[PDB]
Write an enzyme that holds these catalytic residues in place. Structure first.
Site, PDB file in Angstrom:
ATOM      1  N   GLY A 128      29.422  85.605  40.728  1.00  0.00           N
ATOM      2  CA  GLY A 128      30.066  84.400  41.232  1.00  0.00           C
ATOM      3  C   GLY A 128      31.356  84.116  40.544  1.00  0.00           C
TER       4      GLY A 128
ATOM      5  N   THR B 158      34.636  84.731  41.775  1.00  0.00           N
ATOM      6  CA  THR B 158      35.848  84.758  42.571  1.00  0.00           C
ATOM      7  C   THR B 158      36.629  83.493  42.344  1.00  0.00           C
ATOM      8  OG1 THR B 158      34.691  83.871  44.511  1.00  0.00           O
ATOM      9  CG2 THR B 158      34.927  86.269  44.296  1.00  0.00           C
ATOM     10  N   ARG B 159      36.009  82.490  41.717  1.00  0.00           N
ATOM     11  CA  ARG B 159      36.714  81.250  41.435  1.00  0.00           C
ATOM     12  C   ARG B 159      35.980  80.421  40.399  1.00  0.00           C
ATOM     13  NH1 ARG B 159      35.079  80.960  47.021  1.00  0.00           N
ATOM     14  NH2 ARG B 159      33.126  79.757  47.220  1.00  0.00           N
TER      15      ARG B 159
ATOM     16  N   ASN C  71      25.189  88.754  47.527  1.00  0.00           N
ATOM     17  CA  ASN C  71      24.700  87.448  47.929  1.00  0.00           C
ATOM     18  C   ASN C  71      23.343  87.318  47.233  1.00  0.00           C
ATOM     19  OD1 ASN C  71      23.332  85.321  49.411  1.00  0.00           O
ATOM     20  ND2 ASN C  71      25.137  85.376  50.769  1.00  0.00           N
ATOM     21  N   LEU C  72      23.253  86.399  46.281  1.00  0.00           N
ATOM     22  CA  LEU C  72      22.032  86.306  45.482  1.00  0.00           C
ATOM     23  C   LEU C  72      20.800  85.889  46.249  1.00  0.00           C
ATOM     24  CD1 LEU C  72      23.933  86.803  43.149  1.00  0.00           C
ATOM     25  CD2 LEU C  72      22.598  85.166  41.823  1.00  0.00           C
TER      26      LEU C  72
ATOM     27  N   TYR D 299      18.513  71.313  41.437  1.00  0.00           N
ATOM     28  CA  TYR D 299      19.442  71.987  40.537  1.00  0.00           C
ATOM     29  C   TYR D 299      18.993  71.858  39.078  1.00  0.00           C
ATOM     30  CZ  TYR D 299      23.974  73.254  38.365  1.00  0.00           C
ATOM     31  OH  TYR D 299      25.008  73.848  37.660  1.00  0.00           O
ATOM     32  N   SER D 300      18.610  70.662  38.674  1.00  0.00           N
ATOM     33  CA  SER D 300      18.177  70.440  37.294  1.00  0.00           C
ATOM     34  C   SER D 300      16.940  71.288  36.956  1.00  0.00           C
ATOM     35  CB  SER D 300      17.866  68.962  37.076  1.00  0.00           C
ATOM     36  OG  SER D 300      17.367  68.780  35.769  1.00  0.00           O
TER      37      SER D 300
ATOM     38  N   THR E  30      16.298  74.216  38.178  1.00  0.00           N
ATOM     39  CA  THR E  30      16.765  75.578  37.917  1.00  0.00           C
ATOM     40  C   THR E  30      17.534  75.698  36.587  1.00  0.00           C
ATOM     41  OG1 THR E  30      18.917  75.512  39.134  1.00  0.00           O
ATOM     42  CG2 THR E  30      16.918  75.958  40.384  1.00  0.00           C
ATOM     43  N   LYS E  31      18.340  74.705  36.235  1.00  0.00           N
ATOM     44  CA  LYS E  31      19.098  74.846  34.990  1.00  0.00           C
ATOM     45  C   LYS E  31      18.195  74.751  33.744  1.00  0.00           C
ATOM     46  CE  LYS E  31      22.708  76.139  37.101  1.00  0.00           C
ATOM     47  NZ  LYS E  31      23.234  77.546  36.869  1.00  0.00           N
TER      48      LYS E  31
END
Lengths: 248, 248, 248, 248
Positions: free
Chosen positions: C14, C16-17, C65-66, C157-158, C160-161
């Site tokens: 990831g 590219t930016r 693509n994950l 998200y939390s 996963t983090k």
């Protein structure tokens, strides 16, 4: 399912008011004999008398200034003449001496360390006898969310509240073979009568940091201490329980 | 990608040997001017001279006994007569007085807190002037994995190493507006000359707790301090970096 | 003191930016060969070419693509036909699907876990060969301060983090005997191009939580990744480095 | 001081045996109506019948395979036809699929994530209705000491147990305004009948990691869950309580 402490003796330091008094009342409500301490022996005995009248338990008040090693050992001489020994110790006594760091006096720093760390060390060393002998004991150290997050103007207080966690985990390891459990409770923002001097504005600011949107009551902190002294926490030692409404 | 500290002045307390010395040498190898301190001024000046000859940097040695406020003040009076001010402070000096809790004397406890917390407090207060005025400064506190896990025989030491975390987090918040970053490094089991007095027996033991299967070297701890003093750590403050080979 | 990675090959997913790109550029600036990945192979190859022209390093771009195991395998087949193997892996690719919990769909949840945890799992399994055989390797997982504090609208998200921390600690233990170090970097609030779509309003807000009073730059996160890939981090494994300006 | 849950309904997933069954029995012992779930509807109903006979409470058993979203929503259709709603949810169901990382199959990784994170997500989303409506609810997620320390051969399990902490803290923040408290309990080494397949040698090895020198019982874990569902934990949310005998 009830939690009963009849037959046990609990010492709660700095329990003539606030959180410490709520803790002693909560333990008394569960049946524990309680020892109240304060920098004023008179106020300590008065509070002990009130608690004994309200809950009907054996209660004793002793003067104990944690700034003085002499005051502490002397309070314990009185204590051991009143009870066989101590089964539960709640190290609640603690002070703040707030000041931005760059200008904190050595006395402001040292007094905070003397009471919060050294006083806790001495009180705990003096309370272990009966616990180790019977292989049952509970020590609960009152820390603070600020020992984990840090707080402007409280580098001394935060240092001690974080230090109590190292104290708790090390002592828990040493005493575990004797079944004496050592834990910490880290309250967040709790409403005491002292909260009365804060402006409505500052208070709303603090509440904004709390997901539950309210300050906790001293009794809500006392309830967690009660849990740690109960049979429900028999496999917990070396742990910190945060009681802060979701703040940390 | 070069890490250079030419023009900066670093004070590393307790650097006449061990981790402290490795830290001072590492900072000197990046070009920093260094100030070595020890309980023996003669020893500190000697070490400073060896470091100066080996790396070619401006180095000074001063006597500083963290137990004594007078010693500290006298050391800083000398320092400010030799250097414009301090850009980097590494609070490395510390002692242990290992005893099982039930065998710990008040002095075993108080001395460890006075040196490890109060000495660190005073040294830090005395080193901030130039950092604050210029809006750039780095303070690195050396804690220890036992401040996190706790350790038998070390209730006093663990209390101080845990306390340094609350100190770090609180001070980081107060100084952040001035861009003075405050962090801690918590080494695990590091091989120093003090290590040889342990049995090959007891050392293999300790290694059992280490996933990497080896003790770390003083230089590996020093490298992390160097990182925190570099431009690579410009958005890190109030953090602890554990350097323990995976044990915590 | 120079940090050099010439001869090493780094895969940054990831990239590219945003932070991913800043990490890849930072590693290239230290001399590393870099592999850029993105959901658009065309975009990844273009970015790789820009980085190669700017720093003069060998760079390759591959589509990955994950969410798709086939895509991952095809990317690695291409990678191993271009490079002998991977020495450094930075697991940066990740997505958010922000929704209040009561409004979160199973796909909002499953997609975030499939990319952030399962994609990271597969990429890591595919990148270990050379590290293990040579007994040197560095895997850096990009977590986030919200995996620690939690955050409204980000339960997926939390999760996963926070999960990446258990991943990091467990994998660090399994690979430590082979000297392959596994760590995480947990950025706080970092200013990227995605940030401009937020109000100056809501940004000043976020800054309120930051002691340093500013967002960090992608390069400041990249610098910490570089540190973990350097010889200065040789005794650090199973650790999280928070790069958040003092907010946690 | 008693803890009573008469009138409340508690759902405990994966409660046909082990820790989950101890938790359901403990809640039943305090007066709660209980819902037992298992991959076998027959065994779940059998266990529910036994618990109802032993404690005299209303108990229901439903089949629920957390690997299937269909099984979960279907179990809930049955549940909502038996009770008004759920007041207490204990997300206990969890599986392990142990394998060294480098050779873990995608299915071993994904099943662990599907049950431990996605199953918990779906079960929790389905249980919130009554809680949010009445502004009282308790969700307790069973994590593990391994989500904090990491563990060889369990990178998938550790990832999920750490992920549950992010889940807990984020969800606690979102639901706090509704007085629905979300917490986690992280057991250490607990003795279940499955512990019977371990060699005496391996067991002593594990016990050596425990300061209390013994494994905890399922009931000791259930007691902590009971505390979190009680009026004694009204100011606790977003917290993890470790129940591991001093191990972490």
């Amino acid at each position: 399912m009830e939690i009963k402490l009849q037959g046990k003796v609990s010492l709660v330091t700095g329990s003539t008011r606030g959180i410490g008094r709520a803790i002693a009342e909560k333990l008394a409500s569960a049946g524990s004999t309680v020892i109240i301490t304060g920098t004023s022996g008179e106020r300590a005995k008065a509070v002990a008398e009130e608690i004994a009248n309200k809950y009907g338990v054996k209660a004793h008040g002793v003067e104990m200034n944690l700034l003085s090693e002499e005051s502490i050992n002397k309070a314990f001489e009185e204590i051991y003449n009143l009870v066989d020994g101590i089964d539960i110790l709640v190290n609640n006594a603690g002070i703040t001496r707030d000041k931005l760091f760059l200008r904190m006096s050595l006395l402001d720093w040292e007094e905070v360390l003397k009471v919060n760390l050294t006083g806790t060390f001495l009180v705990t060393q003096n309370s272990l006898r009966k616990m180790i002998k019977q292989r049952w004991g509970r020590i609960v150290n009152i820390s603070s969310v600020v020992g984990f997050t840090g707080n402007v103007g409280q580098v001394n207080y935060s240092t001690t509240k974080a230090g109590l966690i190292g104290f708790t985990k090390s002592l828990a390891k040493e005493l575990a073979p004797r079944n004496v459990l050592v834990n910490a409770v880290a309250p967040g923002f709790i409403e005491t009568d002292m909260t009365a001097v804060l402006s409505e504005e500052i208070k709303q600011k603090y509440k904004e940091q709390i997901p539950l949107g309210r300050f906790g009551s001293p009794e809500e902190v006392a309830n967690v201490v009660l849990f740690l002294c109960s049979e429900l926490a028999s496999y917990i030692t070396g742990e910190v329980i945060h009681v802060n409404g979701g703040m940390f």
